Point group: C2
């Protein structure tokens, strides 16, 4: 994988040139695309910009995010050839910083469950996860130092974990979703994929200009609360293996680790995430569902068909439950700086299963809104397994800080 | 003006066919559009649907709201001929209910200060207000029974007041802003224009399906708290003359009216509204500002050029202030059911002033999120004057109930 922070430092000292950095990404891409299929379209003519902290940084953009010079097909036939007039605000944040938009990464149809053709970089016989399939895969295959994705359920954390890349789903609404195809407005959150936590930090600093992402250093003796999300069901052995490995490393590094049970209100918030997501999806994708029903990919079409009956009443009640969940979750962070849990059920599912993985260990946090970060831990049978670091809402800096601490802890 | 609820009842009893109702609107638009210029595009072929609570109901759509069959030009030359791929979710809410999208109404460029060519129905030498200019004017000229607009500051309540129409900016985020050109995601709220409060209720019921909008009837002896927003400065005589008339009509109607101050926190919220708005505008209109700067309308171009320096730091601090204001405001609603205040600084400005009016008496409530309804009170020099009925967040039903109450109280 390519380190954004690495490229930055070298270019800044003159040690490495932007054109060279970009040329490298173009090389890495052409080197494995025929094998990974992480891009809907690759702009081979994309070149480095002249200035900005991100000059010389190639960035892949999930194809539900608007770009003005490349089509934005939403991973759907309904939008084949669709060309937005403008670049999405998050895309502009990168461009204004000097980044190079090297291509549009694959996305499942409307960022839902329908598998793309993209394959896991670590094993072509396995799914790279979803829905930000191309972004996680491209970064995991070492094609680019940065990629944007989105998460409604678990579309950022899960595929990152499956592909062994670092990634962060910032605090809800921090990054604008304007120009980003909506699934559920109460949930949709933009996310970033990179090699390490530090790369994610330099990325957000350039995009937002917020001091909090400047000068981030590994956390010292973090106070970690371990949550296995029992309400999410039985986890797979590999996932638990990763979590224990992370806990062990963290302890040896000086962190105070303690297992904790999540409030009843939070368990409920996890239960009603589907209600909010699906009720809103029907409104957000109303035009497609009413005018191009049969054209909607099979899995999403089925999930929508099964939920046409969700009521405004149960939906309003679900959101009420969500708020109670948030309010009680904040109390949990009075004794711990971060929470640590699974990033996925286990290793990435074989492509034959035709599944991008179950987001059950991811969804709660998208609804709570807290910043979440995936920390690669180990590999079982050659497939990556990671852990999820979560901080208090609005504390993305500390999340990245602790994720870093964790990365080095595992490095012995 | 055309009443949506009336058409609804006459259509439901079989007295009026959906086709005749729509033919009515086409003719009403044809009769005044040449003098009002309220539509960017009038789809003369638009037909009525056979079923649904809104069958036979023509609706005008502010042109920053996506439509799949008609262009969405954002009131800017930058989007001349721009054609969205899908209908925005709110448009679909209307269509699924059986409504007819009769055309796109004028909007100032990107919903800001730059005046449209639309003229006030009551006196073509005056502004119809903005930024939802055409929606207010069209309903005010008796062309259509319903129209959608948006509000970031006062784009719904102010033009409604200027044009003498009923209107509502529902609770923040109740209606999705998906497919609605963003100016400020922290503020943008979709609103509705209609003949009377009851028409707005029927519209929201059909659009949302929420029981709170079903069975709405005039409120009784409501508890009104008069707020003059002194922080915004004194208003023009006409505006005060209208408020005094409303208070008196309500009292003589059986309501208990009491002047009240607004928490210092609430005053500060009003102050930092421009910070949130303009900071986000730069992010939201990044592509336009960066790639088509000189093409942005003069006034918006000037305001953006003047706020390029707003920093993430002052921005974040402004939001904290806004949240604090939201809390301390909820308290105010403990003894009072609804607040009564000004809808605009006074009568509609003369077109010669090249101004859609000052949003100073509207901006606070958009940041607070509360549901606001404009109630036409009287006319000074032939120009409408209205008052703004405000309820607690989420209590839109009551806002409409109290507005219907005020309308009757004014009719004596």
């Amino acid at each position: 994988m390519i380190s954004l922070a690495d490229l930055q430092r070298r270019i800044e000292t003159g040690e490495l040139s932007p054109n060279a950095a970009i040329a490298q990404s173009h090389a890495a891409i052409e080197a494995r695309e025929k094998e990974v299929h992480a891009f809907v379209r690759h702009d081979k003519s994309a070149r480095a910009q002249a200035s900005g902290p991100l000059r010389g940084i190639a960035v892949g953009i999930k194809d539900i995010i608007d770009t003005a010079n490349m089509p934005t097909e939403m991973g759907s036939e309904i939008y084949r050839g669709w060309q937005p007039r403008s670049d999405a605000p998050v895309v502009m944040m990168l461009k204004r910083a000097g980044a190079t938009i090297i291509g549009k990464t694959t996305t499942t149809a409307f960022a839902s469950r329908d598998p793309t053709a993209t394959l896991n970089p670590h094993n072509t016989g396995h799914s790279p996860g979803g829905s930000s399939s191309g972004s996680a895969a491209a970064v995991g295959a070492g094609m680019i130092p940065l990629a944007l994705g989105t998460q409604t359920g678990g579309s950022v954390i899960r595929p990152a974990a499956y592909c062994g890349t670092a990634a962060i789903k910032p605090s809800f609404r921090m990054l604008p979703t304007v120009g980003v195809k909506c699934y559920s407005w109460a949930l949709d959150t933009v996310g970033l994929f990179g090699a390490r936590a530090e790369d994610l930090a330099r990325g957000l600093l350039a995009m937002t200009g917020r001091s909090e992402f400047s000068g981030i250093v590994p956390a010292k003796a973090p106070r970690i609360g371990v949550v296995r999300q029992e309400f999410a069901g039985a986890v797979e052995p590999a996932a638990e293996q990763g979590l224990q490995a992370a806990i062990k490393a963290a302890e040896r590094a000086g962190a105070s680790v303690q297992a904790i049970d999540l409030p009843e209100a939070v368990h409920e918030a996890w239960r009603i995430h589907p209600i909010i997501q699906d009720f809103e999806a029907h409104r957000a994708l109303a035009w497609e569902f009413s005018e191009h029903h049969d054209e909607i990919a099979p899995m999403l079409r089925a999930s929508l068909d099964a939920t046409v009956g969700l009521t405004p009443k149960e939906y309003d009640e679900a959101r009420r439950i969500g708020r109670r969940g948030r309010r009680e979750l904040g109390e949990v962070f009075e004794g711990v700086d971060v929470l640590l849990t699974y990033s996925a059920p286990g290793t990435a599912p074989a492509k034959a299963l035709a599944s991008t993985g179950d987001p059950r260990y991811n969804r709660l946090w998208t609804l709570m809104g807290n910043p979440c970060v995936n920390v690669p831990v180990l590999k079982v049978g050659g497939l990556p397994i990671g852990v999820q670091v979560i901080a208090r809402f609005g504390n993305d800096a500390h999340a990245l800080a602790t994720a870093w601490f964790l990365e080095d802890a595992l490095a012995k």
